[PDB]
Design an enzyme around this catalytic site. Structure first.
Site: not given
Lengths: 107, 375, 387, 820
Positions: A26, A36-37, A56, A82, A99
């Site tokens: 991902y 961010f990731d 999540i 979140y 994502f």
């Protein structure tokens, strides 16, 4: 609050069910375009089991709709991620998460 | 408990190994003698094959030993509230001190050879700034007793043994150009913290040794934890030994400087400060005599405390003697108008009565001999 | 009022006195027993005096008429009363020594002796070790005083404090003259501000508190650091640091020089920006490297933070904040979220300045101890934006 | 833009370099939660790419190397480095095989030294813990300060160590080439970032035996061979690089020291078995000695009638060859220790050529050569090289100072010891961070886990060696230091540390003595400890002298003077905390004064007897500050002891004078009860200061003077009046509900118990008529009240239980003495 937009088709027959480990690659960005990731940077696929609330809730439905080998774009509303609390230092509050998830295999 | 003591072979292996390590280090590692101070100082005092150019480089960058002293001199001059404990300085101060002394009818020829050999070993230090470092470290401690100041005093004594005039001149010059008051303020504070004979501490120890305590893991036979009656007697002796060596050889300039520091903004009379400690020591000795005055025989613990008190009193008397010999008229007048006469009167009272008391039993002849030479 | 006080006061500037003989020529000659002289307090400029109302006090120079302010040192309390000694034209014979001679202070006109007031009980619980100094006919046996020399550095600093305090107080009261009185189309209607004196005084003090150069050797650098810390403490203990803050506060109520011109005129407003920059520069010098001075801001930290957005002295105020944070761990423990957001807002409004980053770095760790609250707040309010 | 463009854009280069410094600051000193957040901004790929980027500017290259260490390795390295100073060696078969020298044929006294850092090390070190950086996991439902502490972000260590080795090897070859464009713009920027990474990984123990050999080849390819390639030591690097080289050599010097400790522990395991087997055999044959010996059998069995520590001291006393008669060991066993002693000295380079041939000679030659080649200007480098030099010259002394931190444990207790080390590492990590709500929970649970571990009680010496009590004390005082007067925060942490130290003292006398060395340190922090309730630093100080005559007699007068000064203050000012809670302002603090009184109670009364040395000092200190006696017993204008107690009872019965008048606060303070408790504590302290009977019968002048002073302070009639005071008794009424007194707000039998102790010890009962007078007014009414309470309803009441304790500890024992 998960919308699954396909990028590359998978097999279209096998789907992840409850209690089955999902191996995914991902890359997560905020909906404005800021990454961010990403599991690609760590060069290690991410493994999780559906139904155990390890990730999540947006990933729970999003990955379940995907097939093995399929690459899809999941847009998760703040409620299914979140949300108001957010992730301190990573994700601002009330942020929609986008994502790019590829379902490598199931185990 | 003796008849039910557990034999060693019934102990668990790990417990026995821990006991072995404590026994082995005390009897085999501590007892081992390894002299490396002379070899280490010699190695650090050599300049390394840089003499193939002999140009105007005659500035002569410090040798490894010189750089070590400058480093410790650097941390002593650092503006700090308290001189923090440094094991590295303590280790090297002992190494430097142990490399300078290295010491029944000695002849005249080798007597001078020992003095010259002593001077050379001291020359390896005071020519590399060691004399100034000792003064800076004493000024840095600000009158706080500890291992740092004790190591510094021992090093200062090591380079001043025999009345080294060259070291005395360097120390005196450094104090006069800096005009700092911290050095004598530290010295005065240290002398006020020197302990004397305390009967309350002595009474507590006698009861403590009568209990016969033991430990849990095994049994200790009357553990010999630190003495609490004149615990810093060795520190007191070297503190006054250091002051004596500053005036050794009838150094009139240093004798006058101890009484008064003209260049400094404030003046501390070390000569008077020595008398102040002598009075406190004399009063403690007088109190100790009264404690044993009723008793017929002085027991072993009392004799040992008497012996260390007399040893300190000998050093103070020697220090006072070194202040005024030469003669130093200024110090003689200072002592004449001081409370020295009160101390001498008190000592004569103790000397007269102790001589009569100690002579009544031959078991205290050794203590009587020590008393006589103190007189 | 005069007190016998011990502790840190023995190294402060308010315990310094100047002995002034009653003559101009050869006033620097050796002091003699029974010689009349005035005793002047260096920092306040007042003279020890005997008044019919309050007894022993210190009065201004306009009330020192050689009768209330004449004192002499005597070796004993015996009533000699031999004869008035005649002064000589020279240094004279040396009589009184520093730190050895015991001197009894006697008021010449009345004959009273300087002594303590024998403080009333039930006041020891208050921690008042101070004993009020009084003039008494008999006194006590321990009334003798030791005269100890003062270093030239401290003596010069005490006189500078006296002159600096008088100038800034005049400057402060001048600002309060037109605090809420617009001049309109006319003069400010008051005495002119000492603008040129204040600017020169600020520049002298800034160069007076300059840190030693890093190129010096270790020995003299530490000596200069020790002197600098002593001078910073001397000024702070006399209220100079609080005096500078009062000057800043009264000048900070004007948003710009033009706004300041509406109350002080154009000729005074053209130096408004220069003075405020010098005030912050002096404030930084008074606290740079001094933990005791920096700890004073642990009670008033919003004072510095709320001024970070001021445009006239943006760089000077940031330097003041940087000096406080790198020295006082107490200030780091009072840092709140609004303080950090204000500092972060400085990056947004003043651009990418690396000094603001250094300020944020100092909020996290001080003296090897980390503050979790500061680290989390900086991370929360700066990183996730990615702007 | 390309980040490599920052080599010319200096304005952005400085800002970005300081940005990396800010990244290290926010995650500095164990802030693992922020470290995970930083992985979202500077990911693993960026960090690994930056390490190998040869065109990065120096400030950026150094910044990214330090950023990687701060995010991933700083926490693990610091925790590991703290454990490297201790040597806990389990007695495992791996430990047994450890020898000082590798098996070889060089020499019997000493073979050639093995490669430092290569071999088997059995010293216990807790493993590193890391967590995968993931930003899609569900946020924990656990609240803040309650969720488990975050671990450091995980990065592949095996790949990282290979890259660090490869980069260091390339730099050595590149440094040999003398290129005019070194990586980072200078030789300093090329080696220092790489050497810091290698040094960090070496401390963490990531490198294996083969990896360590490669590092040694780079440092010195000629000395470190087992049986332009120039080493780092001969490449003429600047001072900054030399500082990093000292860190590398410091690690290998530590490994040699650790090897000696483990080898010494290994030999101890083998040698003890021979000692135990021989002693068992010697004892077996000694039981038949009566057939060929006589009374001197006591001399031979003297060993078996001695403590085991003394037994092993005698067995090892055969070194000087003048003590071969008291030692009963056979010569073959003696030889094994002497053989090991010779090769231990040889391994330290004591006694038994341009090539150093060993680490000890290499380091000593290198440090001297560096100092005589140039005037070193970095004070940090000068200290590092001379600290390293001192170790080489004094190897035996270095081993001597490391043995106190060495400890051998059974292999069956390894898992519990590892758990204890993990908890201790958490506590040690709190010495570098300001206390907060999250750190408070970690401190509390770490203490609880330690006190739940059997090793903490089985091996008190090991806990003392680890400095566990020092670490807990330093954490406590840091919290007490901040806000030392206005308010104490995190009270639960303070009472957890204090309770831990109190149990620490009760494990052994050696632990109690260790805490006694900080008695003055605890007392100076006990002034504000009155605010916290439960276990306080004053309680820790009291627990360090309780029932120990040796420590009681060693109690300095300054410590007692410090306590009395605190007691004097409580007798002159009200409690500031109570005043802020609306309490009426009485001119003293009975609550604070009582806490100091009970500390003096333990200092003067040990094992049921009064310590006259401490008792005399306390009494003299108390009378020199008469305000310690409270508003009563003041002398002028002061009511008597009986009047004060009667006044306190009226205060207790009347609200708006006993409390705030707004338990209600769950620890509500009642001034009426507080006043009685103070005087009861004061009378108890004075009673325990009374001289023992054998001193009074001996006619000692000091003992008689003290008793006379105590009698003057407390008159006998006041003692009888207080004992004769009525006690509220639980009655029945109003449907049959029990009307019981509140023991925390009323006169209690414990107050009377203190008066009885003073009466017995100070005055005593010597005549029959006085005994009868005390009974019918003070004792008999209380005895009847307790007897009447022995019913179905009132037997288990709090007052009835208090009466039973009062009678069975104060009254009835006194009557038994006065039976004749």
């Amino acid at each position: 609050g998960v919308q699954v937009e396909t990028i590359s088709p998978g097999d279209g027959r096998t789907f992840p069910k409850r209690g089955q480990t999902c191996v995914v690659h991902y890359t997560g960005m905020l909906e404005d375009g800021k990454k961010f990731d990403s599991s690609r940077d760590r060069n290690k696929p991410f493994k999780f089991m559906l139904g155990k609330q390890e990730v999540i809730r947006g990933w729970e439905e999003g990955v379940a709709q995907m097939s093995v080998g399929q690459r899809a774009k999941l847009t998760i509303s703040p409620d299914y991620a979140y949300g108001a609390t957010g992730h301190p230092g990573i994700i601002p509050p009330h942020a929609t998460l986008v994502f790019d998830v590829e379902l490598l295999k199931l185990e | 408990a003796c008849f039910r003591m557990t034999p060693l072979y019934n102990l668990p292996t790990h417990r026995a190994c821990n006991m072995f390590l404590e026994s082995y280090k005390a009897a085999w590692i501590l007892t081992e003698d390894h002299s490396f101070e002379d070899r280490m100082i010699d190695d650090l005092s050599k300049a390394g094959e840089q003499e193939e150019e002999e140009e105007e480089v005659e500035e002569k960058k410090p040798d490894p030993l010189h750089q070590l002293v400058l480093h410790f001199s650097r941390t002593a001059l650092t503006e700090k509230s308290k001189l923090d404990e440094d094991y590295l300085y303590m280790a090297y101060a002992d190494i430097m001190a142990k490399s300078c002394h290295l010491e029944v009818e000695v002849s005249f020829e080798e007597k001078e050879m020992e003095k010259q050999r002593l001077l050379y070993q001291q020359s390896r230090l005071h020519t590399r700034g060691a004399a100034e470092m000792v003064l800076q470290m004493i000024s840095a401690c600000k009158g706080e007793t500890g291992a740092m100041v004790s190591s510094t005093l021992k090093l200062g004594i090591s380079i001043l043994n025999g009345g080294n005039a060259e070291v005395q001149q360097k120390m005196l010059d450094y104090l006069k150009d800096k005009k700092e008051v911290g050095f004598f303020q530290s010295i005065q504070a240290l002398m006020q913290t020197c302990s004397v004979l305390d009967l309350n501490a002595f009474e507590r120890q006698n009861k403590a040794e009568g209990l016969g305590m033991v430990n849990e893991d095994g049994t200790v036979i009357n553990r010999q934890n630190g003495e609490k009656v004149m615990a810093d007697d060795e520190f007191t002796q070297d503190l006054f030994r250091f002051l004596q060596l500053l005036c050794e050889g009838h150094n009139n300039d240093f004798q006058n400087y101890l009484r008064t520091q003209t260049g400094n903004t404030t003046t501390i009379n070390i000569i008077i400060c020595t008398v102040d400690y002598l009075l406190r020591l004399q009063e403690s000795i007088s109190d100790f005599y009264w404690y044993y005055s009723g008793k017929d025989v002085i027991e072993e613990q009392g004799k040992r405390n008497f012996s260390k008190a007399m040893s300190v009193a000998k050093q103070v008397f020697n220090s006072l003697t070194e202040y005024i010999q030469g003669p130093c008229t200024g110090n003689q007048q200072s002592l004449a108008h001081s409370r020295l006469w009160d101390a001498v009167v008190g000592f004569l009272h103790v000397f007269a009565h102790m001589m009569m008391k100690l002579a009544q039993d031959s078991s205290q002849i050794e203590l009587l001999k020590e008393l006589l030479d103190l007189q | 009022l005069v007190y016998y006080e011990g502790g840190a006061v023995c190294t402060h500037a308010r315990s310094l006195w100047r002995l002034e003989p009653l003559r101009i020529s050869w006033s620097g000659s050796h002091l003699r027993w029974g010689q009349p002289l005035r005793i002047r307090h260096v920092t306040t400029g007042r003279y020890l005096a005997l008044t019919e109302d309050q007894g022993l006090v210190v009065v201004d120079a306009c009330k020192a008429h050689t009768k209330a302010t004449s004192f002499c040192f005597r070796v004993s309390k015996e009533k000699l009363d031999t004869a008035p000694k005649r002064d000589v034209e020279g240094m004279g014979p040396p009589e009184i020594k520093y730190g050895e001679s015991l001197c009894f202070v006697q008021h010449v006109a009345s004959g009273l002796w300087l002594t303590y007031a024998a403080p009333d009980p039930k006041a020891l619980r208050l921690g008042v070790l101070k004993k009020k100094a009084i003039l008494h006919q008999e006194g006590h046996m321990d009334d003798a005083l030791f005269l100890t020399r003062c270093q030239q550095e401290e003596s010069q600093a005490a006189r500078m404090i006296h002159s600096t305090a008088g100038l800034y107080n005049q400057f402060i009261k001048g600002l309060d003259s037109f605090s809420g009185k617009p001049r309109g189309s006319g003069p400010p209607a008051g005495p002119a501000l000492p603008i040129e004196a204040v600017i020169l005084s600020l520049q002298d003090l800034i160069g007076y508190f300059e840190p030693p150069s890093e190129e010096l050797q270790h020995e003299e650098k530490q000596s200069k650091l020790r002197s600098l810390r002593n001078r910073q403490s001397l000024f702070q203990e006399e209220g100079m640091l609080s005096l500078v803050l009062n000057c800043i506060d009264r000048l900070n109520v004007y948003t710009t020089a033009a706004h300041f011109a509406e109350y002080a005129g154009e000729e005074a407003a053209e130096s408004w920006k220069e003075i405020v920059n010098l005030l912050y520069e002096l404030l930084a010098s008074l606290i740079r490297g001094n933990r005791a001075n920096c700890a004073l801001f642990s009670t008033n930290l919003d004072w510095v933070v709320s001024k970070l957005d001021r445009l006239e002295a943006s760089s000077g105020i940031l330097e003041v904040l940087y000096c406080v944070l790198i020295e006082s761990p107490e200030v780091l423990n009072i840092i709140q979220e609004n303080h950090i957001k204000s500092i972060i807002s400085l990056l947004d409004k003043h651009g990418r300045n690396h000094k603001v980053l250094d300020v944020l770095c100092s909020l996290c760790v001080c003296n090897g101890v980390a503050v979790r609250s500061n680290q989390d707040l900086i991370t929360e309010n700066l990183l996730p934006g990615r702007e | 833009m390309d980040i490599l463009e920052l080599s010319e854009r200096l304005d952005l280069q400085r800002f970005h370099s300081h940005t990396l410094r800010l990244y290290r600051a926010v995650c500095a000193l164990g802030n693992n939660r922020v470290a995970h957040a930083l992985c979202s901004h500077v990911d693993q790929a960026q960090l690994l790419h930056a390490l190998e980027d040869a065109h990065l500017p120096g400030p950026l290259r150094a910044g990214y190397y330090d950023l990687l260490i701060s995010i991933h390795l700083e926490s693990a390295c610091r925790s590991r480095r703290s454990m490297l100073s201790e040597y806990i060696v389990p007695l495992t078969p791996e430990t047994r095989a450890i020898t000082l020298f590798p098996p070889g044929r060089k020499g019997g006294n000493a073979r050639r030294h093995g490669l430092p850092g290569v071999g088997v090390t059995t010293s216990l070190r807790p493993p590193h813990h890391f967590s995968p950086p993931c930003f899609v996991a569900a946020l924990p439902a656990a609240g803040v300060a309650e969720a488990p502490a975050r671990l450091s972000p995980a990065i592949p260590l095996e790949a990282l160590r290979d890259k660090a080795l490869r980069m260091l090897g390339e730099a050595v070859r590149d440094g040999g080439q003398h290129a005019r464009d070194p990586v980072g713009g200078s030789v300093e920027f090329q080696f220092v970032p790489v050497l810091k990474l290698v040094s960090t990984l070496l401390v963490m123990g990531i490198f294996g035996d083969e990896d360590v050999k490669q590092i040694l080849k780079m440092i010195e390819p000629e000395v470190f061979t087992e049986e332009l390639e120039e080493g780092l030591l001969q490449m003429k690097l600047p001072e900054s690089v030399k500082l990093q080289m000292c860190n590398l050599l410091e690690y290998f010097c530590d490994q040699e020291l650790q090897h000696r400790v483990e080898s010494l522990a290994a030999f101890a395991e083998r040698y003890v078995d021979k000692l135990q087997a021989n002693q068992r055999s010697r004892y077996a044959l000694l039981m038949r000695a009566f057939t060929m010996s006589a009374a001197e059998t006591a001399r031979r069995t003297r060993e078996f009638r001695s403590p085991p520590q003394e037994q092993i001291n005698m067995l090892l006393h055969f070194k000087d060859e003048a003590d071969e008669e008291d030692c009963p060991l056979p010569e073959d066993i003696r030889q094994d220790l002497q053989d090991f002693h010779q090769d231990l000295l040889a391994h330290c380079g004591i006694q038994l050529e341009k090539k150093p041939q060993s680490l000890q000679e290499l380091v000593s030659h290198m440090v001297v050569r560096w100092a005589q080649e140039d005037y070193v200007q970095s004070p940090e480098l000068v200290r590092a090289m001379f600290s390293l030099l001192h170790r080489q010259y004094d190897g035996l002394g270095e081993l001597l100072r490391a043995l106190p931190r060495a400890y051998t444990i059974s292999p069956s207790s390894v898992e519990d010891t590892m758990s204890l080390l993990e908890c201790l590492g958490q506590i040690r990590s709190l010495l570098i961070v300001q206390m907060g709500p999250q750190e408070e929970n970690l401190m509390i649970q770490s203490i609880g886990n330690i006190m739940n571990n059997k090793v903490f009680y089985q091996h008190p010496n090991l806990m003392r060696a680890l400095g566990m009590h020092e670490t807990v004390m330093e954490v406590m005082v840091n919290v007490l230091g901040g806000g030392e007067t206005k308010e104490i925060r995190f009270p639960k942490m303070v009472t957890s540390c204090c309770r831990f130290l109190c149990y620490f003292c009760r494990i052994s006398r050696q632990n109690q003595r260790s805490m006694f060395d900080h008695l003055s340190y605890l007392l100076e922090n006990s002034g504000i400890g009155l605010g916290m309730q439960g276990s306080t630093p004053l309680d820790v100080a009291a627990a360090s002298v309780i029932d120990n005559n040796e420590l009681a007699l060693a109690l300095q007068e300054q410590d007692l003077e410090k306590v009395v000064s605190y007691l004097a203050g409580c007798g002159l000012q009200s409690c500031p905390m109570l005043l802020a809670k609306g309490y009426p302002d009485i001119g003293w603090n009975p609550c604070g004064g009582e806490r100091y009184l009970d500390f003096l109670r333990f200092a003067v009364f040990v094992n049921g007897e009064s310590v006259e040395e401490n008792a005399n000092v306390v009494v003299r200190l108390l009378i020199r500050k008469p305000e310690c006696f409270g508003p009563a017993l003041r002398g002028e204008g002061g009511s008597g002891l009986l009047a004060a107690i009667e006044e306190a009872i009226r205060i207790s019965e009347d609200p708006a004078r006993d409390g705030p008048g707004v338990p209600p606060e769950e620890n509500r303070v009642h001034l009426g009860h507080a006043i009685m408790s103070f005087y009861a504590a004061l009378i108890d302290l004075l009673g325990r200061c009374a001289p023992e009977m054998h001193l009074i019968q001996a006619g000692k002048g000091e003992a008689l003077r003290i008793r006379a002073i105590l009698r003057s302070l407390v008159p006998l009639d006041d003692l009888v009046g207080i004992i004769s005071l009525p006690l509220q008794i639980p009655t029945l009424g109003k449907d049959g509900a029990l009307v019981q007194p509140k023991m925390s707000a009323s006169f209690v039998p414990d107050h009377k118990a203190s008066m009885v102790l003073f009466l017995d010890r100070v005055y005593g009962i010597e005549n029959q008529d006085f005994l009868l007078h005390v009974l019918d007014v003070g004792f008999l009414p209380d005895m009847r009240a307790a007897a009447s309470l022995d019913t179905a309803t009132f037997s288990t009441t709090e007052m009835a239980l208090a009466l039973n304790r009062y009678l069975c500890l104060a009254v009835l024992p006194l009557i038994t003495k006065c039976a004749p």
